[PDB]
Design a protein around this ligand. Structure first.
Ligand code: CL
Ligand code: CL
Lengths: 64, 38, 64, 64, 38, 38
């Protein structure tokens, strides 16, 4: 009946708004992980750069 | 004399990583709260 | 008509439950990535610590 | 009434399709982050391997 | 004598990273399965 | 002579990381677009 369909429709509309808010928060979480990954990648490049520019030259130098 | 070796410091990048991950977990908790309202 | 609205409402309610389960799994996936990121960050700190506490002192020492 | 329930049902069905597409894109984003994490983990293993196989032996060698 | 150099070992952290990423992909597959039911 | 030290090169892995993260952000933008249609 119409009464049943309408209550279900209202319940579903409310659930849809919660799903939308949930995905928005999930997307925000993923964006945070992307930022973390970028920061970590930057740190790893710094590690590579330190090894090649400071550590390596110093090892060779330690021979003379 | 010999050349000194500057200590590598990526502590700030690492701190940023941990803060971002904490924010991610907080957001996931909020997402789950909305899902529970269903 | 009411018959059409009710079938649609039931279809939508079923879809909503699938969407909820989907997001729950997506959130679980993100949590897994967060754990992976943390483990990798821990490894990177260990790399930094090894370079500064073991490698660097040993290079200087290799000069004497 | 049936008219109200049907309009709501149609609105909800359209929203559900958008939610499904949204989660699909979110999942794609997470998969991208997983690939990034794997690439970064591979780089970190390469760093460890370089330190142990090239750097360390060279430091010891610099003493002789 | 000279001081020996302990080999860096982050193999366990790396293994944990790969296991977590595998779990993430499994969860994404499950998410997609639910979406396909729509 | 003494043994030379090969420069570590993980530039390709790092480039792949940044490209993947860019793709992730693009996908999140698309997800948000669908959500806004609601
Ligand atoms: Cl990561
Ligand atoms: Cl409905």
């Amino acid at each position: 009946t119409a009464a049943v369909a309408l209550v279900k429709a209202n319940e579903n509309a409310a659930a849809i708004l919660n799903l939308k808010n949930a995905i928005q928060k999930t997307n925000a979480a993923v964006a945070d992980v992307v930022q973390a990954t970028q920061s970590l990648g930057t740190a790893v490049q710094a590690v590579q750069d330190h090894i090649n520019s400071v550590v390596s030259p110093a090892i060779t130098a330690a021979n003379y | 004399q010999i050349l000194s070796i500057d200590p590598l410091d990526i502590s700030q990048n690492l701190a940023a990583v941990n803060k971002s991950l904490s924010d991610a977990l907080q957001h996931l908790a909020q997402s789950d709260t909305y899902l529970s309202a269903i």
